[PDB]
Design a protein around this nucleic acid. Sequence first.
DNA 1: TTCACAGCTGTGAAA
DNA 2: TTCACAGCTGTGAAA
Lengths: 437, 436
Amino acid sequence: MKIEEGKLVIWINGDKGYNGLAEVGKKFEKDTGIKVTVEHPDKLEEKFPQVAATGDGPDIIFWAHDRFGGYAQSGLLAEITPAAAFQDKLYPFTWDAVRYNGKLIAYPIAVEALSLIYNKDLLPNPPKTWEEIPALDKELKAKGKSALMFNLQEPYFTWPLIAADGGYAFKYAAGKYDIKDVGVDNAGAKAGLTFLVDLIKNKHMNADTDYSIAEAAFNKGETAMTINGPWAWSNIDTSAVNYGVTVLPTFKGQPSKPFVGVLSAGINAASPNKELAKEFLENYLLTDEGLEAVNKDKPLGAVALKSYEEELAKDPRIAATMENAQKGEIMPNIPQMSAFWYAVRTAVINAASGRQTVDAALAAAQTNAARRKPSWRERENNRRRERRRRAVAAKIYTGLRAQGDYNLPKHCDNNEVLKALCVEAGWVVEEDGTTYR
Amino acid sequence: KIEEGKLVIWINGDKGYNGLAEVGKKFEKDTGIKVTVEHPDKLEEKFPQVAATGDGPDIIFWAHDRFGGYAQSGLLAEITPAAAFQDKLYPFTWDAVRYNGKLIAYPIAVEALSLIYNKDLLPNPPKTWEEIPALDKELKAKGKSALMFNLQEPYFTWPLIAADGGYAFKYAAGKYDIKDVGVDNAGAKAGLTFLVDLIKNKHMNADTDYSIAEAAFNKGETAMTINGPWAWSNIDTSAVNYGVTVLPTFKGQPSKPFVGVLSAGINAASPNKELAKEFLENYLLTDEGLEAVNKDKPLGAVALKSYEEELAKDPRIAATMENAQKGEIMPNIPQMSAFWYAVRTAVINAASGRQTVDAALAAAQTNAARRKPSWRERENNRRRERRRRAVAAKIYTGLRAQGDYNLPKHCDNNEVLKALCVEAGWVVEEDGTTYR
DNA sequence: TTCACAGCTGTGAAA
DNA sequence: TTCACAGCTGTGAAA
Ligand SMILES: OC[C@H]1O[C@H](O[C@H]2[C@H](O)[C@@H](O)[C@@H](O)O[C@@H]2CO)[C@H](O)[C@@H](O)[C@@H]1O
Ligand SMILES: OC[C@H]1O[C@H](O[C@H]2[C@H](O)[C@@H](O)[C@@H](O)O[C@@H]2CO)[C@H](O)[C@@H](O)[C@@H]1O
């Protein structure tokens, strides 16, 4: 797909209220006559950087703020130019989440933080620590239930426990994130991941559990607790589960530290509709009625627009969400964040599966998250150097075959021509390559 | 991984997995086994990869066409149905799920694509593909569109490619001949050229996938879509008054869908083979069980003769079977996977403009039977090149050690090769050109 | 930082 | 069928 003048195409993740956002698009079409299409393709955060480099992709992309720094360093996003008057309608810290190299590269929409979600009837008084979790699962499995199930395939859901005792992604120091100071391999992170693996070894959780499995189970009533964000509440509401949203348990006495995400809307640098996209975002979506319609579909969390957030903050689920947020940290938006997420994802999955030890899986994730990504030019330099090396050899052997008269078979490899060269120069070469004068 | 006394089930995400969950819990009551139903992504791809390591599901629900490559790799337990039991299901279902005189899965439901249309926007559905462009120009003025369907999966486009003569593997002399592929003939070309021309004239979008097609129809923005019985439940919950009818004709010929028999083969590495056959023979393929799955997302024309009597009355099933009769059952042979991939690549590359229709289908025709190199073959290659490097590395190691050439402190083997050339009375130029 | 050999697989040649 | 160089990137050495 390419962005066409006169229409808007939006990409938002499949767990967000895309139907609600589509309704906001219809009003935009009614007031101004521009068609708005909302789509939720899988792996949209990976698809966008691929297509958008060529000028393809949607007009607007929705994702947590951590992915956008990479998008901006690749020149995939337009610079956001809201008047000062409009910026003041959004909390300053949400603008910070979409600031990169001094510039605003997206519109903040809502603040997202994981929370503990528990079945009140199946578990009154939910656990306050992670350590009492195996004990609470013994009693529950008695009733044929499980204690806790959440997504183990995306490190987002495990990071709160890894960060509890001291794990961290990139150390902040002197006003910037140090991309060489990674904390996925320290004692705190090892302790968090070990306690997770010990739950699986001791059968209190299964390592194959993904988002849908963990969802299905809590909404059906087969587990007392789950870990999820505000988007998941709407589906629980329609189930026959009486649930609450509370602080995440402590680990080794310390609070769980979820990585906080700001759902943000970036404008594709190739869109011929930047003014329309800005009009749609500033004066339709980021309004009380715009966010409400999306919010009614799947809760957004703590929205960035002050006016509608003072209404949503009355909700005790949002207060809990922000209680967990306060204990965590805003995600960095630097380009290396995708490299940190890939490394930790591989680590958690390998350790959860027994394919690697915790110490080994995290040591590799530390090296991967810190790994210097070579530039296109460096890649090109390397490619050209090996191209030159082969061609020089090819010419040497091309010439050695033409003028050599080396008593060679009709077809044979360079290794044989080299052998014949060796004997002409006064060497003997065994079959295995051992060579001496 | 599998653990004895439990039952984990894999089935595609567009089927009534929750309905099978309701069936799984009643299997608990009688036999006490806890059953879980998971709907993973690309399960027809993940299964042939994870099965060797013993990782995998007890049961896989999928269309029959891929099981022949599965069974030929040894991933499924051959099925042992009583002669009574074959008689309890239609003989042509067993025929589709049989490779090499052995029964690899249990037939469950017959699936065929049909035209689904919004009566309020289109009381009379078009009988031909050719009138769809004009019909779209009409509905566009009303802010609607004529037709949207999944262009990413060739299953949905194949009916139009087959209409004017396109075929996969010509069945001749009692077997499918992989020497006779018809993805490159004039009928296939005409079928794809028309589909691309719909896109070139902005009557369809090359990027439309299953999700985009379903939303646009269920929301009433498009007047028609092409889909199977599973999609009906979501239209039901929608506010759209829909009909299910015969597919449009192309150049006066019917649309020829590939008919799939949803089958259920058994994990050759499962420790619950007969603990699961209780499910497959005496629980799922029963009138009461198929009802639970059909209640969630409709199965289509089930293979149980008993329940198909009641469901065949449904005018939607009759249309589904009306389209089925005009098409063909899919081959179940191993080359199917390579045929689907080749056709998937042709459709997408022609829809996107990346390739002309001629170039795309010409590439597909050669790929549809391309042989996958065996593991041993790959290992032969790997070992050959390992041998080649070690021989050269030993030569250059000996030259560097005993050669006493006038070489830089650190240099590549090419530099050593040159100093060995000049020693043999050759002159090597800068760029490698070499003579005596 | 640049650099060179390893390494596996791809293209297509020689049967 | 086997075979061989191409081709790009990985690992790790030497500054
Ligand atoms: O798991 C790594 C993943 O974490 C975050 O993604 C979240 C997203 O922020 C939420 O809105 C929700 O959709 O769940 C996602 C995890 O499945 C990061 O934003 C993302 O970049 C990262 O890959
Ligand atoms: O698109 C190629 C694909 O077609 C069929 O897949 C169908 C499947 O049979 C249906 O049950 C449903 O899931 O829709 C699918 C199309 O997306 C073949 O069964 C499959 O082998 C083939 O790859």
